[model samples]
Target: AQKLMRTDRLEVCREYQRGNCNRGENDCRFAHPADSTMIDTNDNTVTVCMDYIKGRCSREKCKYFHPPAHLQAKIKAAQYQVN
Candidate 1:
């Protein structure tokens, strides 16, 4: 049997998109983007910390991944290359 998700189609707070919410993840009645993965087939996507990248990402609440320098270099190279 397939399990159903609680907020399958409901809209969650968009606050997580920008950064952390003042209400916190547990307290906020909204979906956390960090809790989910934004997998993309395209190579254009870059996972950078909002605080580090945007100069405002939170270490504790930022959902985006902060890949290491070595991996990041590889990712960038691959993305820049023609498929």
Candidate 2:
């Protein structure tokens, strides 16, 4: 199976996942698997789950992102404003 390219910088490092990363934790730009929920920086363009936003996501372990409450509100406002 083909590996999905990480859309968010905060997403787990694909290189690290594949055991190809040589960079240390502090040196790497992408997030390590252990620090999956760690937000090192703000990402306004971060990906979020549309289904989750619409209250329809059914997967117990959804692959898409589910942002914090405040960010979710912001996304909802932004998306609706554009419609």
Candidate 3:
């Protein structure tokens, strides 16, 4: 048995944990607009912004995320937007 996600065959998993680092069921906005976890790179420690990442960017944006452009390629490579 095999299944492929619509986006990129990302292997759909049932555990969709959104904003899960706080003390709320389906709510993690506790003293934070976005999470603190980050991806470490050679030159910079990129804020993972897992809580803020989305398929689109014009909708609800991260208040903590100040942006002219954030996560340019990685986010864009994931097919996210810039507006």
Q: Which residues of candidate 3, in runs, are more than 4 Å off?
A: 1-43, 55-67, 70-76, 79-83
Question: How many steric clashes does model 1 contain?
Answer: 3
Tens-place lDDT per residue, model 1, 4-74, is: 11111222345645555655334655433444454222432334443332234446655455433433333
TM-score of each: 0.26, 0.38, 0.21
**Candidate 3: pairs in clash:** none
lDDT tens digits by residue: candidate 3, 1-83: 01212221111112223323433233322122232332223322233232334433343444223122323334334432432
lDDT of 2 by residue, 1-83 (tens): 01222223234446766566755345555434332443333542235556555555657565555554544554455443233
| TM-score pick, better of 1 and 2 | 2
Candidate 1 Cα misplacement greater than 4 A, ranges: 1-7, 22-24, 39-83
Best by lDDT: 2
Residue 70 of model 2 has an lDDT of 41
Count of residue pairs whose backbone atoms collide, per candidate: 3, 0, 0
Write down the lDDT of every candidate, Cα atoms only. 0.38, 0.46, 0.28
The TM-score measured for candidate 3 stands at 0.21
Q: What lDDT is reached at residue 60 by model 1?
A: 69
Candidate 2: what lDDT? 0.46
> Model 1: C-alpha RMSD to truth?
15.3
